[PDB]
Amino acid sequence: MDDVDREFINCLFPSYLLQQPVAYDLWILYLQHRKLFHKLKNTNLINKLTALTRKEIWSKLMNLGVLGTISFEAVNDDYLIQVYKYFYPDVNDFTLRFNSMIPDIYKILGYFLPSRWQAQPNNSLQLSQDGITHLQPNPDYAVTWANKSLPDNKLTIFYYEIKVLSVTNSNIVIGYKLVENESINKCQKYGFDLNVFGYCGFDGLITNSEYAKPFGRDDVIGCGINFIDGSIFFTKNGIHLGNAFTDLNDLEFVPYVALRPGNSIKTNFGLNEDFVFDIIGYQDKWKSLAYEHICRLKFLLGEDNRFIDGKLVRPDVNNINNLSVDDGSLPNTLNVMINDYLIHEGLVDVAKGFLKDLQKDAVNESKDVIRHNERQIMKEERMVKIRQELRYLINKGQISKCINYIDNEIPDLLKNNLELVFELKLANYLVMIKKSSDEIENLILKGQELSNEFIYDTKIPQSLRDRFSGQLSNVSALLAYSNPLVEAPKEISGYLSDEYLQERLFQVSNNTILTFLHKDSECALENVISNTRAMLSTLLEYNAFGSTNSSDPRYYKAINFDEDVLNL
Amino acid sequence: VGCFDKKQLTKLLIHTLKELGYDSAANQLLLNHIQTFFKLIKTGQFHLINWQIVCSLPLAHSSPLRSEWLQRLLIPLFDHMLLQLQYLQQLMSSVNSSTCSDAEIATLRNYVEIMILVNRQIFLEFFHTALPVLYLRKILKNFIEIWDSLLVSNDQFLNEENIFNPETTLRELSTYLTNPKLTAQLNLERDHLIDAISKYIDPNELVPKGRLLHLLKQAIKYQQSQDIFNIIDPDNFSHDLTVTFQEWKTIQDTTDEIWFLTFSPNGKYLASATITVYDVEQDFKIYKTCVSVLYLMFSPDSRYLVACPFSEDVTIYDRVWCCDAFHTAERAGWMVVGSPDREAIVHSLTTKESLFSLKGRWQYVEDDETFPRVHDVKISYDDKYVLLMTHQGVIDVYDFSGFPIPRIARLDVGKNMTCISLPLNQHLVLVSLQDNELQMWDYKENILIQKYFGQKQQHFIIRSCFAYGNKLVMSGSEDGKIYIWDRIRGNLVSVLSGHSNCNVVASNPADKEMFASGGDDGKIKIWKISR
Amino acid sequence: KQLTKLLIHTLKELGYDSAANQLLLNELVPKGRLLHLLKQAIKYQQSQDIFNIIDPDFSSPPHRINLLQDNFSHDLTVTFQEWKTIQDTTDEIWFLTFSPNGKYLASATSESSRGYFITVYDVEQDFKIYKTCVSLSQSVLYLMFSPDSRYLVACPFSEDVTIYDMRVWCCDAFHTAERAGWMVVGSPDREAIVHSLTTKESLFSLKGRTCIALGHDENISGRKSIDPAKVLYKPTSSNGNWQYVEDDETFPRVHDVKISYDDKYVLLMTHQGVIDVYDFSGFPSKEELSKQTVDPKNFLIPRIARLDVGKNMTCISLPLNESQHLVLVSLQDNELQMWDYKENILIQKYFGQKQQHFIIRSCFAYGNKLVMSGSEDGKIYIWDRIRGNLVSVLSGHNCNVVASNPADKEMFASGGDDGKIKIWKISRN
Amino acid sequence: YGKKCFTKEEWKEQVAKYSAMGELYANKTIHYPLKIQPNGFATIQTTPIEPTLPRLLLNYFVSMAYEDSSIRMAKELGFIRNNKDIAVFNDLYKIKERFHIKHLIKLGRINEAMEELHFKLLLLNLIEMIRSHILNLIQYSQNKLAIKASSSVKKMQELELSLQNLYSISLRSKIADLVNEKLLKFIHPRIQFEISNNNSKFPDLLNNNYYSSEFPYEPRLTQIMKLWCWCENQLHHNQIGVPRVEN
């Protein structure tokens, strides 16, 4: 992450929510619209000559029918805007063109969580143009809920707080409501239906029932749902009250408020202003609880013995993977696996040091591992020297000698592996471009020669020919600058980074060399890490049983793998 | 003169006489800035284009520059353009004070854009070694950066197609560099530049190219807008008459009602679904009887009839509810079947040998939900699009690239639907509905063009179609009247009454002027146009 | 290249003879041809516009003609300006009506100060009160102005009728002179009556004197159920026979009555949602009934058509002086329909107003160009007539009555719950 | 076994839907395979495999008191320059002393290690004394244990003392590992202070909540393997089937 994307995403999304396993899709959402926000950060985003929203506005007006027997062709744009102003008065002159003083742009990002109160079809209420700033049930001729309904199998904790600032013990009924909607008559008559989990304000008694004292003139009340064990709780003035409900997993909810015509409120969902309850201090407690519950011949593992041509019959047993620290199998498997990873790619000196050190540590099962490990480190000795030489050549920036070496050792590889020689020649060209700082009369000739080699030969397939052109245009766009590592944009300058060249040519070339000789190219360690990260997501996707029955805590919803486990 | 302006009339006449090719008349009837700039461009001596020969143009939208910036911009061929860029650079340091009424910048942006266009032409003229890079880098990256700054400092740019223009321009210019073939395949003569520059100028000072022809075509359109039965398609007049609708032949063949009618794609046979086929070029003598059926089709060769029965599978003459054949000679002989069972399998006239059955078959997405349950199908004449009805009031359009599967669009209408009636040989479609309306959709861009009103249609099934080329649109009704709308404008041209509901209407795709109507009174009538 | 001859002819015509002669190096085209084709093209360009509302009346010089680029307007070519506000004694307003000569305004208040009295304002003398009426306290409901522009008719809620000089909820008057001083009354008790508003004895009842549907046209439709004779009212018709069947059904509750401008067609609303039209084209004349012993109640009247629309109607209106057999109908479920009653055809639909739970009026205006209505907000909705698209939404309050001026072409009054009586003037065209 | 049963291709597709950043994002036209056929039709990924393993390797080496491997892996990562920073790094985590103490305790010579919890160490010393084959034993036990006997009922039960587990090597290795964790916990604050204000170059290789109080002071790869086996077994309890890892 750069030094601007972090700031922008922090300004956009709520703080407590970026620390959940649901920060990944939020980062994807932001990443889909990076350049546009980068440009727009100049002005006109702090609290008309349509071009392509023309057809969408036209369709959305003809849906109502205020346009009759009038052709799509020959329509005055200003007429459409004028008529649109009559039925969408709050249009903030930005949709036509199509802490955080940013107006409602989350419609573009597709932010899938509630953000504002939505207005009922009647006029028995009025909200101050945002759904947040000021809600008041205007004089009669009052219930409402949030716009979107939060899902259940995609997050862990949700929390929003309202501030009451007008009185008729106040008379507001707030909380959550189960959603089967766009049951309301009784909601408008009383303060709650049979499916409204709410905290009243007349006396404080929870709905559907001595819970807590009533709130009054200026009070801040927050409504939090916890999906780890299925609970709903309420807080007032930053002091956590008791948990109000229990056993509510696998449902769907929406924020809900019923208000008497004498009281007014100001809501907050955490987008702009921070809370007072310190929800982070509540979330880390459950994270620590989950970590406490989870983490408190023979060694070599082969293929799984349950696979028959895509059929997985499951022997009826307690559990499949019985590896325990007390037995000692886990360190054995970890040691053999770590040595395999080390000798897979260079670092043979470190592997020899490891063999020496766990030869020294043992005192008179823990020697079969040493013997097998020594055999493994001494058998594959020819590939390790080639790998080390390749690493030296790539790190020295001598890619032409690298091609000479690859062709020299393995005879029959380059002649029929064009998709690798392209990735090597392009890197050689990039090295030349980076070094050149009057060779500019030769860069052009080199680029034209290799373009004519890799584009206009037509013996290559069509998709490959089309792909070899995008990379060439991208690398060509570098020449227009004079110090491309600083002046150029993020991506094009990304081509010149140490990462790309040095940590990608080797990654491609090593795996190519291994897979050409009919050997597996998986280290079985990053395989383990990726499998764990995918298993956590596939458990989160399907609401799962915690220990015995689906009424206990579900602890896999608190294991945020990357930021909490993979970074020291 | 009349009510126009005499000077405007004279200027238009002079430019028209020049444009026709004549010289002496225009050059004698006389008894500039844009002109001299255009001459400079046309002959080509760009090294003479100083700032004030550009700033003197009468910009289309706003007023000229304030008489303070032009002073710094008029302090006095690589060196010439470098000098111009150097002169421009100081104006930015002067305007850093940010004192502008959102319009001075709105003019400086236009001027910078014109200058960048001229420089782009200069650059592209180098391909018809190490000179293009030295030119591009400085003498264009600096202009592009300045233009981007000016564009950004406005509350006017459309987020969609106005905000990435400098970036895409510079990217294209830089990628042309190590790929010269695209420069050759570019069509970069010295007149498209003049076209764009003229697009930047005031249109009431530079007479637009070919205006009198435009106004004459408009006047012909006005005249055509009086009578809608004509052949003219863009001196004294072409209107002021009257026309009429006359029925002349009736068929009281039986007493049962009529469900469906169809005319041969060559105008030589009339099908009926009471199955009977009538000769039509021989004074309507019954040709044959073929042996319930509720849909008819003819082969594009106009040889083989295809029925579409109720419970039996299919029948062909020398569940399934609709069938439409292709048109392309490459894939001719192939046709598409429908079914109210969520199934659509391409097929042919070999009574066997099925093909792609789509009951489960710049970006792509994963498979969606199921149960299409097609009702009526249509095939685009270029055979490149397949249109399917549903029962939940939506239409699907599928793309067929080549057999010897995605969906381009899903058109939503709401209310229940009926016949589709693809236009007769842009993209159009005429969906009939309940709720007493007709809609003229557009399946290529997924937008509703217009609506037609006035035909009773509730809890039954009625038919509509095109007629008189693609100029008239007619429909049946619950009351036994035929309704006939103008298509371009959308007003009720005629309401005939010849049945006592009327179900089906059809036309020759061979004769411009006649059609046929059948109803539930047990009758078939033929109508024609009198003058 | 026929263009060359026309160009030479017009160049010689306008005054540059030398240019035409130098240019010289299918029936002798007439004088001033281009000066006509350009006018035609300008008219077409004006037609293709959307903002233009054609004033009912070439010589416009206001710097608004330029044959170098297509010319069109940006704002609406007409403007609406509020002018007054008669907000004295604001209890409630329900009904407004002008006079055919446009010299009075009539407003129906509700029980405010002097009973349920109504008000009549002068128009020339700065809208000063011309007459406050004395009414039986029953919150009068309907008003009408006699075609002589003198008599005022008021129909209240509690089974009476009042006539003023200068249960029945449906009043209308005849416009032709051949039957002068006659009116038609419609009641929710399933009653329709012909009445004279100076003697007030009776003239002719209904509910049992109507042959249903007139059967068919020249018996083509057949439909034989029961056939009475030709004792039905009809002149020497040359269109077909319209006294076929004497079928019947329960008389429908009538909630509005209208009479065409040739006394030839009377439209009656129902409650179920249908309109039915009758034709007193053979009703005895005043002179032929004053002396001759011709008597109704042993006769019957045909029924030209029965317009079925669905939902329950609220009001019907007729134009002032493309076909001329038009009617504008209001109805709930947020719509406004236009029909051709003499043909049973639906012409146009208008959307946008909020119409539910109440009784809201509508009317024509600007001669015939605009159609305005109220809504359940305080807003006033004004549509273009020919094409049916919104042209304006003003604010005037809920507002439940509007009325145009049948004599000034440029003014119309509004009325809503809060008692305000706003006058609006239409200008710039 | 009918909930979400997977196949090799399907599970591979499910895994691949992560799109790791790798510090080379915003360049979305780089991540594509190779399709290297000869040797036949294979596939190789260009996205970085796992861009954070070389720090977990160093953490494992240091936290297991592995000296030579620690030095070499620090060399092959970019932290070492000369023969003085070697010494300061070896004294920053005091790897040699921890390794010597752990090796001694594992060997069974408790007293020598003790000459540098405490009750468990004394219990092992007493076990050694009993395994050697009394008034001196009485005095020893009395003083050094009655000073600590009256603390709970668990301690008395432990002091009272399966048969082949008390004399095994596991009981001599578990307490060695636990004391190693205790020394890591004790040493950790000083590294934080030194790298914070004394402006060091080396990073902090260790990070009433259990997480923040006992989670880091252990080989991180061992915790990851614990979590891996836990998740693989938790998938089986809900009848969901996924392929295992081959080798």
Q: Which two tokens stand for residue D131?
A: 């395994």
Residues A341 and A529: beta-carbon distance below 8 Å = no
Cα–Cα nearest to A229, from A243, A239, A241, A240: A243
Q: Which residue has the tokens 């040359």?
A: C238
Every domain of chain D and the residues it spans: 53-228
Cα–Cα nearest to B270, from B254, B258, B287: B287
The verdict on residue A26 lying in a domain is no
Residues C267 and C253: beta-carbon distance below 8 Å = no
Per the structure, the count of domains in chain A is 4
**Which of A67, A78, A86 minimises the CB distance to C389?**
A67
Torsional class of C131: left (φ above 0), alpha (ψ -120 to 50), beta (otherwise): beta
CB contact under 8 A, B223 and C41: no
Q: Is the dihedral of CA B75, B80, B86, B87 positive or negative?
A: positive
Residues B374 and B322: beta-carbon distance below 8 Å = yes
Distance separating alpha carbons of residues B182 and B174, to the nearest angstrom: 12
Same domain, A421 and A374: no
- CA D140 from chain centre, in angstroms, equals 36
Contacting chains of A (3 CB pairs or more, <8 Å) are: B, C, D
Q: Which two tokens stand for residue C136?
A: 């039986």
Distance separating alpha carbons of residues C205 and B451, to the nearest angstrom: 45
Would you tell me which residues 108-167 of chain D have a C-beta closer than 8 angstroms to some C-beta of chain A?
A: none
Distance separating alpha carbons of residues D114 and D112, to the nearest angstrom: 5
Same domain, B262 and B138: no
Q: Which two tokens stand for residue A493?
A: 């300058």
The CA distances from residue B283 to B270, B298, B507, in Å, are 12, 21, 16
Residues C145 and C152: beta-carbon distance below 8 Å = yes
Q: Is the dihedral of CA C186, C191, C195, C201 positive or negative?
A: negative
In order, the DSSP letters of B319-341 are ----EEE---SSSTTEEEE--TT
Residue of C nearest to A83 (CA): C390
Q: Which residue has the tokens 């402006």?
A: D199
Residues C351 and C375: beta-carbon distance below 8 Å = no
Distance separating alpha carbons of residues A383 and D121, to the nearest angstrom: 48
Helix D95-107 to helix D170-196 angle, to the nearest 10 degrees? 170
Distance separating alpha carbons of residues C78 and B3, to the nearest angstrom: 22
**Which of B5, B222, B500 minimises the CB distance to C220?**
B500
Domain extent at residue A353: 300-379
Distance separating alpha carbons of residues A155 and A172, to the nearest angstrom: 28
The verdict on residue B223 lying in a domain is no
Residue of B nearest to A492 (CA): B171
Distance separating alpha carbons of residues C271 and C274, to the nearest angstrom: 7
Distance separating alpha carbons of residues C278 and C233, to the nearest angstrom: 11
CB contact under 8 A, B453 and C348: yes
The verdict on residue B231 lying in a domain is no
The CA distances from residue B123 to A235, A300, C260, in Å, are 68, 66, 77
Cα–Cα nearest to C340, from C390, C304, C389: C304
Distance separating alpha carbons of residues C312 and C300, to the nearest angstrom: 28
Distance separating alpha carbons of residues D85 and D79, to the nearest angstrom: 9
Cα–Cα nearest to A253, from A364, A336, A119, A153: A153
Q: Does B222 touch chain C (CB under 8 A)?
A: yes
Task: Let me know if B416 is exposed, middle or buried by CB neighbors in 10 A (0-12, 13-18, 19+).
Answer: middle
Distance separating alpha carbons of residues B293 and B258, to the nearest angstrom: 11
The amino acid at residue C141 is: L
CB contact under 8 A, A292 and D224: no
Cβ count within 10 A of residue C15? 9
Distance separating alpha carbons of residues D71 and C69, to the nearest angstrom: 82
CB contact under 8 A, A51 and B161: yes
The verdict on residue B15 lying in a domain is no
Cα–Cα nearest to A448, from D27, B133, B119, B120: B133
Element holding C327 (H helix, E strand) = strand C326-331
Helix/strand/coil (H/E/C) assignment for every residue in B132-180: HHHHHHHHHHHHHHHHHHHHHCCCCCCCCCCCCHHHHHHHHHHHCCCCC
Q: What is the CATH number of the domain that holds B379?
A: 2.130.10.10
**Which of A68, A74, A78 minimises the CB distance to C389?**
A68
Task: Provide the experimental method for this PDB entry.
Answer: cryo-EM
CB contact under 8 A, C351 and A78: no
The verdict on residue C312 lying in a domain is yes
Distance separating alpha carbons of residues A284 and D213, to the nearest angstrom: 13
Cα–Cα nearest to C85, from C413, C349, C369, C428: C413
The amino acid at residue A527 is: N
Residues B315 and B328: beta-carbon distance below 8 Å = no
Residues B493 and B515: beta-carbon distance below 8 Å = no
The amino acid at residue B424 is: L
The amino acid at residue C224 is: K
Element holding A37 (H helix, E strand) = helix A34-40
Residues A355 and A375: beta-carbon distance below 8 Å = no
Residues C405 and C102: beta-carbon distance below 8 Å = yes
What number of CA atoms fall less than 13 Å from residue A345's CA on the CB side? 21
CB contact under 8 A, B9 and C67: yes
Residues C155 and C168: beta-carbon distance below 8 Å = yes
Interruptions in chain D after residues (C–N over 2.5 Å): 39, 116, 133, 161, 207
Cα–Cα nearest to C182, from C202, C166, C210, C212: C202
The verdict on residue C362 lying in a domain is yes
The CA distances from residue A1 to A487, A493, C92, C233, D245, in Å, are 19, 15, 68, 92, 31
Same domain, B202 and B252: no
CA distance B221 to chain C (A): 8
Q: Which residue has the tokens 């134009």?
A: C319
Domain extent at residue B55: 32-209
Q: Which residue has the tokens 């068929």?
A: B251
In order, the DSSP letters of C67-93 are TTS----SS-SSEEEEEEE--SS-S--
Cα–Cα nearest to C34, from C58, C14, C16, C63: C14
Q: Which two tokens stand for residue A561?
A: 């793998």
The verdict on residue A310 lying in a domain is yes
Residues A232 and A150: beta-carbon distance below 8 Å = no
Distance separating alpha carbons of residues B522 and B512, to the nearest angstrom: 27
Q: Which residue has the tokens 């959102």?
A: B102
The verdict on residue A214 lying in a domain is yes
What number of CA atoms fall less than 13 Å from residue C37's CA on the CB side? 24
Q: Does A83 touch chain C (CB under 8 A)?
A: yes
Torsional class of B192: left (φ above 0), alpha (ψ -120 to 50), beta (otherwise): alpha
Element holding A446 (H helix, E strand) = helix A440-454
- Strand C345-350, strand C335-340: pairing: antiparallel
The verdict on residue C91 lying in a domain is yes
The verdict on residue A540 lying in a domain is no
The amino acid at residue C326 is: L
- Strand B394-399, strand B385-389: pairing: antiparallel
The CA distances from residue B409 to B361, B413, B442, C162, in Å, are 16, 13, 10, 65
Phi and psi at residue A100, to the nearest 5°: -100, 100
Helix/strand/coil for D150: strand
Helix/strand/coil for A286: helix
Cβ count within 10 A of residue A6? 10
Same domain, A89 and A213: no
Cα–Cα nearest to D194, from D205, D209, D181, D183: D205
Q: Is the dihedral of CA D223, D225, D226, D228 positive or negative?
A: positive
- Compute the 3-state secondary structure of chain C and give helix, strand, coil in percent, each to the nearest 5: 10, 30, 60
Would you tell me which residues 274-333 of chain C have a C-beta closer than 8 angstroms to some C-beta of chain B?
A: none
Q: In what order do the strands lie in the sheet with B492-497?
A: B464-467, B472-475, B481-486, B492-497
Per the structure, the count of domains in chain B is 2
The verdict on residue C268 lying in a domain is yes
Residues C370 and C382: beta-carbon distance below 8 Å = yes
Same domain, A225 and A92: no
In order, the DSSP letters of A115-180 are -SB---SSSS-EE-SSSSS-EE------EEEBSS---SSS-SEEEEEEEE-------EEEEEEE--
Q: In what order do the strands lie in the sheet with A196-199?
A: A143-145, A253-259, A172-178, A196-199
Distance separating alpha carbons of residues B209 and D147, to the nearest angstrom: 110
Distance separating alpha carbons of residues C118 and C163, to the nearest angstrom: 12
Chains B and D lie in contact, requiring 3 or more CB pairs less than 8 Å apart: no
Q: Is the dihedral of CA A80, A82, A87, A90 positive or negative?
A: positive
Sequence length of chain B is 531
Element holding B464 (H helix, E strand) = strand B464-467
Our CA angle for A5, A12, A160, nearest 5°, is 145
CB contact under 8 A, A67 and C350: no
CA distance C143 to chain A (A): 29
Beta-carbon contacts below 8 Å between B and C: 100
Distance separating alpha carbons of residues A414 and A420, to the nearest angstrom: 8
Cα–Cα nearest to B88, from B64, B54, B121, B59: B54
The contacts found for A387-392 with CB under 8 angstroms, 24 or more apart, are A387/A345, A387/A346, A387/A510, A387/A513, A388/A346, A388/A348, A390/A506, A390/A509, A390/A510, A390/A513, A391/A346, A391/A506
Q: What is the CATH number of the domain that holds A251?
A: 2.60.120.920
Cβ count within 10 A of residue A423? 17
CA distance A484 to chain B (A): 12
Query: Which residues, other chains included, contact B269 with Cβ-Cβ below 8 Å and sequence gap of 6+?
Result: B263, B277, B278, B279, B280, B287, B298, B302
**Which of B2, B5, B25 minimises the CB distance to C22?**
B25
Cα–Cα nearest to C74, from B210, A34, A81: A81
CA distance B436 to chain C (A): 9
CA distance B71 to chain A (A): 30
Distance separating alpha carbons of residues D73 and D57, to the nearest angstrom: 8
Cα–Cα nearest to B474, from B414, B524, B442, B518: B518
Query: Which residues, other chains included, contact A310 with Cβ-Cβ below 8 Å and sequence gap of 6+?
Result: D7, D8
Distance separating alpha carbons of residues D120 and B42, to the nearest angstrom: 99
Q: Does C65 touch chain B (CB under 8 A)?
A: yes
Distance separating alpha carbons of residues A205 and B226, to the nearest angstrom: 77
CB contact under 8 A, B222 and C347: no
Q: Does B28 touch chain C (CB under 8 A)?
A: yes
The verdict on residue C21 lying in a domain is no
Task: Let me know if B23 is exposed, middle or buried by CB neighbors in 10 A (0-12, 13-18, 19+).
Answer: exposed
- CA D12 from chain centre, in angstroms, equals 30
Same domain, A86 and A150: no
Helix/strand/coil for D179: helix
Q: Does A482 touch chain B (CB under 8 A)?
A: yes
Our CA angle for D37, D40, D44, nearest 5°, is 45
Q: Does B225 touch chain C (CB under 8 A)?
A: yes
Count Cβ neighbours within 10 Å for each residue of B169-195 and write b for 16 or more, e otherwise: bbbebbbbbbbeeebeeeeeeeeebee
The amino acid at residue A426 is: L
Which residue, among B20, B235, B455, B500, would best test binding to C if mutated, counting the most C CBs under 10 Å from its CB? B235
Chain A residues within 8 A of D57 when measuring between CB atoms? 338, 342
Helix/strand/coil for A565: helix
